[model samples]
Target: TISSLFSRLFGKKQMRILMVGLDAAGKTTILYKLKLGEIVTTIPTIGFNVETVEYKNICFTVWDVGGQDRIRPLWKHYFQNTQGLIFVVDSNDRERIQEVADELQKMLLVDELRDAVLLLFANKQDLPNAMAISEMTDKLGLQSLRNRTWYVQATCATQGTGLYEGLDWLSNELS
Candidate 1:
């Protein structure tokens, strides 16, 4: 029977991930990179983009939301059912590091995201003046987060690096 076959194949596990960051942090690029396995030229996301990415036996449904200042207030609407929170950062934008940190801290305060694990991507690592992962970790206050499982990965979305490592952490957290 098909039912029996389905059971034999193993139950598929799925996770909902919310991806957010300041505008131009490369959230959409990373999403397409993971979903399509290649860099895709992307325009700014006005609302949100969703894609299912299967990896390591887990199907991750990622929600990439727009991050413009005016759009930031709407991010909470997508927080429901999120198992993972991906906060991308423009590693070379040192001027806005504090701004990103504040946004991240504020989001972690949401009740809906209390149980979600955080995955920070220090993206645009190929930039000549990219910030180091340690700097980002400290600036983002990742070490101070209590009662949450979190990780940070260095990434260059244009080159398709470090995205999978971020996913690997999420999958491991699930297990």
Candidate 2:
């Protein structure tokens, strides 16, 4: 019944998304907020969590990976078949910006993700010192990714602000 209902709605396809970021960057919070509209307190993810959020005709299967340094190596396990990437950043973690930049560059260069679309989330925007979009773009060295399909949005995952805007962008591009 669910399959029939889904097919009848719009007959859309599915999108596989990989969500990666530093620990405490609010990846799980954002995922739950978007999926259920419930504010959830999340511990550091050990390996990964898979969540499916349907938008219009698209079903988004999001793979949220742990961001701790040791966990980074395991990311490649899920790189295959990924259609999009959601890279979350802690806006108030000023000191770790460079590390984030380095990580982003490395991830984007992976052969498996060469053509995947990227969506960057500048999370924790409610914090007082949260960096602005321009600053994040600069600090993250996104300028060098001019040829890739990517978008950056300011978000406060706990309060659910700017979450859908980012999803809307992704859904539009994917469809």
Candidate 3:
């Protein structure tokens, strides 16, 4: 009866997600938009934040971690039981591209994330000279990892263009 009750309520097992990105990479901002559909215009996260939402019938409690170098040690705390990860990159920040890539490589190597679904969200693509998803993937060794896992995409979260598309992919993966 308990199992049947759970199926009747949740319909399917829900999942948890951990969203990580560099400072000012729009990670928490994207959570705000995804959870509340409200654009957060200013203020950077001091450390991190968490929010939960149900979209398209699936539920996710997202931990929006701050990417500050000083707080790096605490990052490992958020990885447990993570079903998937959405690692965002500020596509417009050319100077930090390598930093982003190196850090993401470290994340990929994490034992907790070894089997977790990864979605590399290259954000801020609406800007000029922003790196494309293909280019970012190649630079970050994601292209080489294609056989290991799943899809990654470019998302312009401020404009709401690519956010839900990523969600669609996540939902499909969950199902």
Question: How many residue pairs clash per model?
Answer: 0, 0, 0
Winner on lDDT between 1 and 3 is 1
Rank order (by lDDT, best first)? 2, 1, 3
**TM-score of every model versus the real structure:** 0.74, 0.75, 0.74
lDDT tens per residue, model 3, 1-175: 2122113234455555667777788876676666533322322355545455544334444443334454544556556566777788898899988888777777787787787778778899989999988888777777778545667778888876777777667645644
Q: Of the candidates numbered 1 and 2, which has the greater lDDT value?
A: 2
* TM-score, prediction 2: 0.75
Q: TM-score of predicted model 1?
A: 0.74
> How high is the CA lDDT of each candidate model?
0.69, 0.71, 0.66
Among residues 3 or more apart in sequence or in different chains, the pairs in candidate 3 whose N, CA or C atoms overlap within 3 Å are none
True lDDT of residue 92, candidate 3: 86
User: How many Å off is the CA of 118 in candidate 3?
Assistant: 0.7
**Candidate number of the best TM-score:** 2
